[PDB]
Amino acid sequence: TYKYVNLREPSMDMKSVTDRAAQTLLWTELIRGLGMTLSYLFREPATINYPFEKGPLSPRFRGEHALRRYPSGEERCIACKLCEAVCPAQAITIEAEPRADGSRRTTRYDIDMTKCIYCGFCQEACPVDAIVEGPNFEFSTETHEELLYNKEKLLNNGDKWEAEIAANIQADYLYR
Amino acid sequence: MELLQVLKRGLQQVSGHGGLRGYLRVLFRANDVRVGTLVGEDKYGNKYYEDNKQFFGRHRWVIYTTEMNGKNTFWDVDGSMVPPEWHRWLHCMTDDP
Amino acid sequence: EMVRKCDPHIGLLHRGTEKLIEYKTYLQALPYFDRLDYVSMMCNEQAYSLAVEKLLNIQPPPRAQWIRVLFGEITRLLNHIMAVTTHALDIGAMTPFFWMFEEREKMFEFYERVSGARMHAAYVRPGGVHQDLPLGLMDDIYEFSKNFSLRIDELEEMLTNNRIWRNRTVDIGVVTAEDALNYGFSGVMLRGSGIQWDLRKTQPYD
Amino acid sequence: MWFEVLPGIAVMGVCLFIPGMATARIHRFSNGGREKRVAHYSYQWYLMERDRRVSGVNRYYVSKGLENID
Amino acid sequence: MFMINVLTLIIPILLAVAFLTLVERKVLGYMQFRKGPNVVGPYGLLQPIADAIKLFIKEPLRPATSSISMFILAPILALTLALTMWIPLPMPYPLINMNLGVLFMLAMSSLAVYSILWSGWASNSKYALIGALRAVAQTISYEVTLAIILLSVLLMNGSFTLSTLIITQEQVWLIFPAWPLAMMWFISTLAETNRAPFDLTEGESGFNVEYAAGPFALFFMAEYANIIMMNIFTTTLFLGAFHNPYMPELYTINFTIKSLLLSITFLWIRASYPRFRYDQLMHLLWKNFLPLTLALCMWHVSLPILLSSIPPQT
Amino acid sequence: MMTYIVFILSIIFVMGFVGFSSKPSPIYGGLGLIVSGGVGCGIVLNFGGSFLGLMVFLIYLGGMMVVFGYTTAMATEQYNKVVLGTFITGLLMEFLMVYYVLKDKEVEIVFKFNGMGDWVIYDTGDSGFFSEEAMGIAALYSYGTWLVIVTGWSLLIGVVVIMEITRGN
Amino acid sequence: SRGEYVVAKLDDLINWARRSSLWPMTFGLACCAVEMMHMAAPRYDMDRFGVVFRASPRQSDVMIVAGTLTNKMAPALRKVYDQMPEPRYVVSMGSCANGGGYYHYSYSVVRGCDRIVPVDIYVPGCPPTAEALLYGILQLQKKIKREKRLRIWYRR
Amino acid sequence: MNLMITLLTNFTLATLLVTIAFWLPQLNVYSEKTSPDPMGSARLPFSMKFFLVAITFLLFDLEIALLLPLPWASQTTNLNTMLTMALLLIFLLAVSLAYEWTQKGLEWTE
Numbered sequence A: 001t002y003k004y005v006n007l008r009e010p011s012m013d014m015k016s017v018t019d020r021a022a023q024t025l026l027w028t029e030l031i032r033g034l035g036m037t038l039s040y041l042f043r044e045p046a047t048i049n050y051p052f053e054k055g056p057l058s059p060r061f062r063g064e065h066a067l068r069r070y071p072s073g074e075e076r077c078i079a080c081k082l083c084e085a086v087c088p089a090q091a092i093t094i095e096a097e098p099r100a101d102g103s104r105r106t107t108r109y110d111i112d113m114t115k116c117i118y119c120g121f122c123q124e125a126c127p128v129d130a131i132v133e134g135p136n137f138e139f140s141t142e143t144h145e146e147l148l149y150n151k152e153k154l155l156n157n158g159d160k161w162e163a164e165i166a167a168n169i170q171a172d173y174l175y176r
Numbered sequence B: 001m002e003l004l005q006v007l008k009r010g011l012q013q014v015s016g017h018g019g020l021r022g023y024l025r026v027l028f029r030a031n032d033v034r035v036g037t038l039v040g041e042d043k044y045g046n047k048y049y050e051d052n053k054q055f056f057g058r059h060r061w062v063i064y065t066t067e068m069n070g071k072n073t074f075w076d077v078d079g080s081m082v083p084p085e086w087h088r089w090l091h092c093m094t095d096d097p
Numbered sequence C: 001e002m003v004r005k006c007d008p009h010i011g012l013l014h015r016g017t018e019k020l021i022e023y024k025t026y027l028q029a030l031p032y033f034d035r036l037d038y039v040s041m042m043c044n045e046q047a048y049s050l051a052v053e054k055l056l057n058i059q060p061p062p063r064a065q066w067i068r069v070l071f072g073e074i075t076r077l078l079n080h081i082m083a084v085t086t087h088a089l090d091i092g093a094m095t096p097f098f099w100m101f102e103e104r105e106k107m108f109e110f111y112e113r114v115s116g117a118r119m120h121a122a123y124v125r126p127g128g129v130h131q132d133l134p135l136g137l138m139d140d141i142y143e144f145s146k147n148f149s150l151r152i153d154e155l156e157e158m159l160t161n162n163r164i165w166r167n168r169t170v171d172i173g174v175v176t177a178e179d180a181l182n183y184g185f186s187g188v189m190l191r192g193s194g195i196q197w198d199l200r201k202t203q204p205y206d
Numbered sequence D: 001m002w003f004e005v006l007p008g009i010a011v012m013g014v015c016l017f018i019p020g021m022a023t024a025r026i027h028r029f030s031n032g033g034r035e036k037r038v039a040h041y042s043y044q045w046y047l048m049e050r051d052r053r054v055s056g057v058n059r060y061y062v063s064k065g066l067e068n069i070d
Numbered sequence E: 001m002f003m004i005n006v007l008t009l010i011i012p013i014l015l016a017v018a019f020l021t022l023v024e025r026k027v028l029g030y031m032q033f034r035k036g037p038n039v040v041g042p043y044g045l046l047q048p049i050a051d052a053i054k055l056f057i058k059e060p061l062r063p064a065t066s067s068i069s070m071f072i073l074a075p076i077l078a079l080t081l082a083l084t085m086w087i088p089l090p091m092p093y094p095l096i097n098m099n100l101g102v103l104f105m106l107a108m109s110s111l112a113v114y115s116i117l118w119s120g121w122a123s124n125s126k127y128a129l130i131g132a133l134r135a136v137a138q139t140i141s142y143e144v145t146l147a148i149i150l151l152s153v154l155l156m157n158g159s160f161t162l163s164t165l166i167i168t169q170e171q172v173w174l175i176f177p178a179w180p181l182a183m184m185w186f187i188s189t190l191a192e193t194n195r196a197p198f199d200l201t202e203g204e205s206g207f208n209v210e211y212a213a214g215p216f217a218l219f220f221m222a223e224y225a226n227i228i229m230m231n232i233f234t235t236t237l238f239l240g241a242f243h244n245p246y247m248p249e250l251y252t253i254n255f256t257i258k259s260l261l262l263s264i265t266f267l268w269i270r271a272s273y274p275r276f277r278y279d280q281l282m283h284l285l286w287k288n289f290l291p292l293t294l295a296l297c298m299w300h301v302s303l304p305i306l307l308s309s310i311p312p313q314t
Numbered sequence F: 001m002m003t004y005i006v007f008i009l010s011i012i013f014v015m016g017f018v019g020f021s022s023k024p025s026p027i028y029g030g031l032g033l034i035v036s037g038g039v040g041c042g043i044v045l046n047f048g049g050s051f052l053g054l055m056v057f058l059i060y061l062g063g064m065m066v067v068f069g070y071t072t073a074m075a076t077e078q079y080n081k082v083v084l085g086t087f088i089t090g091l092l093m094e095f096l097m098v099y100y101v102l103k104d105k106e107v108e109i110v111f112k113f114n115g116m117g118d119w120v121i122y123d124t125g126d127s128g129f130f131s132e133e134a135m136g137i138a139a140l141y142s143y144g145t146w147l148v149i150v151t152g153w154s155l156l157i158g159v160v161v162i163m164e165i166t167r168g169n
Numbered sequence G: 001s002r003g004e005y006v007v008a009k010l011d012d013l014i015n016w017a018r019r020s021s022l023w024p025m026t027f028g029l030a031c032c033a034v035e036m037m038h039m040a041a042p043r044y045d046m047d048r049f050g051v052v053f054r055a056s057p058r059q060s061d062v063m064i065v066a067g068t069l070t071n072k073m074a075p076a077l078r079k080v081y082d083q084m085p086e087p088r089y090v091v092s093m094g095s096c097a098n099g100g101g102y103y104h105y106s107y108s109v110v111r112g113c114d115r116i117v118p119v120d121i122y123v124p125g126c127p128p129t130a131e132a133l134l135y136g137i138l139q140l141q142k143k144i145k146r147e148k149r150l151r152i153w154y155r156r
Numbered sequence H: 001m002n003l004m005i006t007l008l009t010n011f012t013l014a015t016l017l018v019t020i021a022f023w024l025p026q027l028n029v030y031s032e033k034t035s036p037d038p039m040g041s042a043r044l045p046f047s048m049k050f051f052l053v054a055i056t057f058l059l060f061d062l063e064i065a066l067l068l069p070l071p072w073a074s075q076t077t078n079l080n081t082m083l084t085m086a087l088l089l090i091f092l093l094a095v096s097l098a099y100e101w102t103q104k105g106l107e108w109t110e
C-alpha cells in the first residue's frame, strides 16, 4: 500500500553506463523535451475569441442579484427578512412598512455588491423565490456607488433578465 | 497531394462572407474568419452562428451589429450587447435557440 | 551568496477569520473555509463539516460520502497542479505552467456545474451536500479523466529526466525523520522523509 | 492552426533581406556595373591607384582595355 | 551614396528587433498552447508600433542619480555598440570590408560590458551593483571562452577576413569537421546574450532596475540587436551558404533562411529549460567548458600541419 | 585641417589625459582615460596599424580596464577646487603650446620640435600581398622562442602570485 | 479648424497606442490572483489583447489589486503605486479590494482599496470570473479610448 | 573616413533616441515624485571571489592575446618551432587552469 518513488537502483553494466554517458553528452532527454515542445507547437490552441465567443457555464450560475415578479405584475418579495438574516456578509438591508392596500411589501431593499460574496444563501433562503442570483456577470462599474444597489436597480435588473431567469429556474428547480 | 484541400477550404472561407470585402470586414472587426451555419439574428442586428465541428467553446459565436441604441459600434463591441434570449444560447445555458 | 538565518515575516494577509466566526452562525461560517486555502477550496469544507457532524452526532447519507471523496480528490488535482507548476515557474521553466492550466480550467467547469461557482462553491455542508450532481455530469467526468493520464506523463517528461531541473532539486531541502516529527510537519514532509504516515489510511474518514 | 505566425516570419525575412540586396545594388551601381574593388593589401591598392591614374577620368570603374594602346 | 547604405543598414535593424519582440511573443504564446497578439491588426502586425509609441510617451522612474552624465552615457553606448557592430557582415558583401572584421566584432563584444557596469554605477542601490558585478563576471568569463572558440575557428580558416570565410565554406560546411566546437559555440551564443536557461538578470533583480523606461527600452533593443547579430554570425560562419559572384540574392535568401530558423531555435531553447544558478554556470565553464575547449584548440592547431591542409593567408 | 587628423587626435589625446590628470574620483578618471585610450587607438589606426589598434581595443580597453572598473566598484562609495585649478592650468599650457606649434611651427622644450603636419614621413612603397605588421606579429612563433618562454613563465608566476598573496594566510 | 482636427487625430493615435499595449502589475495577494492566473490560461489568453503577463512594477501601465488589502500591506501598496510611472490606472478585483467584502467589519482589513489609491474600474465578484475581468479590461480600454488630453491641452 | 562617417551617424542616432526618451516626455505635466532595496544601512560587502575571478579573467585574456596570431603565423617556414611553441603555450594555459583549480580557486563560486 506504499510505493518507493525514487528508489530505482541504476544498472552498473557497460550498456547502461555508456547510454547514460551518451545522454549526458548528446543531451538526449533535452532532445526529448525539444520534441515534446515541437509536438505541442502544432496543436490547435484553445483560445476562445472573447467577446465574440463565451465560456461554457451552467444554469446554476451565481451572478448579479435581481428581484423577480409574479406572472401578474406584483413584486414577489413579502419583506420577510430571511435573506438579510442569512447573509454572511450583511450586504442586505431591509426596511419595510405596510403599504396602501395593506400588503406586506418592502420600502428599502439594499444589496451592497461590494460587500456580497456571491454565496447564494439569499436565493435559497427566500421562500417565494423573490431574490435570485441571476446569470449576469458583465456589470463592472467605473464608480464605487454604482455597485451599491437599491430596490429600484434590483427591480430593473429583474425586469431586464426575467426572460432568462424564469427559464433557468424552470430548468433547475427540480434539483432544489 | 493534400495541400489543395486546405487551399480550397481557405478559398471557401474567403468566398463565404460575400466576397473579399466582407472577408476583410469580418477579419478587421472580429479577428476570426471561419464560416458556420447562421442560427439567427435578433432585432438589434446581432447575427448568431453555430459550427458543431469545432471544439467546445468555439462552436457557437456572434457577430455584433453596427448600431445598437444609437451608438456607433463599428469597432466598440461589448460583452453585455447580447439580449437574454440569446444570452442563454451563447453561454451554453441550453441547446435551443 | 549563502544563508545562516532566514526569518520570514507574515501577517500581510491577516484578515482575522477565526474571530469573525464567533459572531456568525455555523452555516454562515461555512464560506469562510473556502477562502482560507484558495487552491484546496473543496477540501477545507470537508474538514469543517466533519467537525460539526462530530458534535451533532449525525452522519451524512451514503451518496453524500462518495461525492465528498470524489470532489475532494478532484481538488487534489486542483492543488498539486498549483504545487509543481508554480514551483517550476519560480525556478524558471514556464512551459508546462500553461499546459496544465487548460486542464485546471476544465475542472473549474465541474465546480461551476454542480454548485454554481468556479472557486468558492460553498457546496459541502454539515449533514451532506447542498445540491445533487446535474444529470450527465459524471459522464463528463469520465471522458475528461480518461485523457488526463497523458497530461501527467506530459508534465513528467520535461521535468523528471531534465538535468537542469535535477541540479536545482536533488540536494536542496533535506530533512531527517526525527526533526520532521518534532517540527509539526505533515503530508509530503513526513512522506518525503520516509515516514509512513497518511491520514487516509490510518484514521480514515467518510 | 500552425500557419498563423508565418506572416511575422515573412516580415522578418523581408526586413533581413532588404539591406543585403540594397548594398549589393548600391555596390553594383556605384562601381560602374562592377563589384567594389577590395584592398586588403598594399599591392591591390597600388593597382587601384594605377587604374585611377591610367583611366584619365579619376574614376577607376571606367576601365581602359586593349583599344587604348596602339 | 554611402549614407543611403548606412541608413538602409541601421533602420531595418530597429525594425528587425521590434519584430523580434513581436515574433518571440507569438512564438512563446504558441509554444505554450495559447495565442499571441492578434487583436490590434491582421495577425498582430501593428503591435510593435503600439509598443514603440507607448514606450516613447511614458513617464520616467525618477532615480536618485549619483552621476547624471554616466546615466545618460550608458544607453547611448549600449545602442552604439549594438548598432554600429553590424558593419563587417558579408551579405554577400560587407558595408565596410576589414581584414580584421572578426577581431573588430570580438573587441567590441568584449567591451560591451561597460554599459552594464555604468548601469550598475548609476543606480545607488547596492543590490543592483551586486547584480551588475555578477553579470559582468559571467559575461567576461563567457567572452574568454568565445575568444578561444573563435580563435580555433579562424585558425581553421587561416585568415581574419570575414569575406574569405564564405569562400572557405564552399565545398562543405564548417559544422561538419568542427561539430564539437559547434556545440560549444551554440551554448556560448545561448549564454552570452544574458538568456534563459542562464538568465540571472531576472531571477533573485536586474542591472537596470532604477533606470527609466526609455533607457530600459534602449537596453532591450540593444540586447536583441546583439542577439540577431550573433545569430547571423553563427549562420554565416558555421552554415555558410552558396554564393554566386553574379547571382548574389540566392545567397542572401539562403542565409536569411538559416538566420530565421536559428532565431526560431533560440526561441525554442529559451522556452524549454528552467533557469540555472550562478555557481552552476560558473562550474559549467570553469570546470567543464574550458578544458574541453583548450583540447579542441590544441587539436585544431595541430591538425592542418599533420594533414598538409594549412589554409592560405590570402 | 583634415590632413593633420592624427595631430588633432593627438591634441584630443592630451586632452584625454587631462580628463583624468586632476583625479577627482576614480570612476570619472577611468571614463576619461577610456576616452583617451579610444582616441590614442584612433591615432594608431590612422598610421595603418590595424592589428595593434585592435590589440588596444580588445585587451587594454575591453579586457583590463573592465577589471579596473570592477575593482573600483568594490570601493569608492557613492554620494574639487584645486582639481579645477589644475584643470585650467593644464588647459592654458595645452592651448599655449597649441598656438606655439600653430604659429611658430617650431618649439624647444627638451629638443627641437617642428609644428608642420605629419603627412610628410609616410611611405609610398608597397609591401606586396601582405600587411607588414601582420606578419611582423606572426613572426613571434617562428623567431621569438625565448621571449615567448619568459612571457608564459611570467604570466604563470603572476597566477601563482594571485593565488598566494591574496590567500590571506 | 486645422488645429482641433490635427490634435484630435494625434489624440486618437496616441490613445490607440496606449490602450493597445496595457502592461499590468499583478498583486498576488489572495484568491482573485489565482483567478487572474486562470484568466492568463490559454483559454482566455490576455496576451492577444496586447496585455503581457507579469511585468515589472517599474514599467507597468495598470495595476490590478486582487485580494484583501490589510493594514500591514497598505503602505507597501501605496509605495508601489507611487513608484509606477504616469499614466497609471487601477483595476479592482473582487469584493475585498472593492469594499472589503466578507471582511468589511474585520479589525485589520482596509474597507476598500479606494482609501489608499484612486481606482478606475471596479470588477465585482468573489472571485469575479476570468471573462468578467476580461470585460473589465476591455472597459478600461474603452475608457482610455475616449480620453481627450490633447484637445483639452489645445483648448486651455 | 567612411567608417568614421558611419560611427558618427550611429552615435548621433543614439543621441537622438536618448533625447527623445529623456526630453520629449517633459512636455507633459503629470506630477512631481517626492518619493520618501534590501540594503538598509550596511556597507557593501567585499565578496573576494568576484575580484579573484575578474583578475583570473584578466590574466587569461592577456595570454589569449599572446595566443592570438596563429592564423597569420601558420604560413611561416619553420613549422616545427611554431608547433612546439603553440602546444607549449596551450599547455601553459592548462597548467595555470590546473593550479587555479587546486588552490581552492574554484570553490564557493565554482
Ligand code: SF4
Pocket (backbone or CB within 6 Å): A083, A086, A087, A088, A089, A090, A091, A092, A111, A115, A116, A117, A118, A119, A120, A121, A122, A123, A133
Ligand atoms: S449571495 Fe450570500 S453574501 Fe451575497 S447577498 Fe446573498 S446571502 Fe449575502
Ligand code: SF4
Pocket (backbone or CB within 6 Å): A076, A077, A078, A079, A080, A081, A082, A083, A084, A094, A125, A126, A127, A128, A129, A130, A131
Ligand atoms: S427572503 Fe425573499 S421574501 Fe424574504 S425579505 Fe428576502 S427577498 Fe423578501
Ligand code: SF4
Pocket (backbone or CB within 6 Å): C035, G030, G031, G032, G033, G066, G067, G068, G093, G094, G095, G096, G097, G101, G102, G125, G126, G127, G128
Ligand atoms: S473577493 Fe473573494 S475570491 Fe477575491 S480575494 Fe476576496 S475572498 Fe478571495
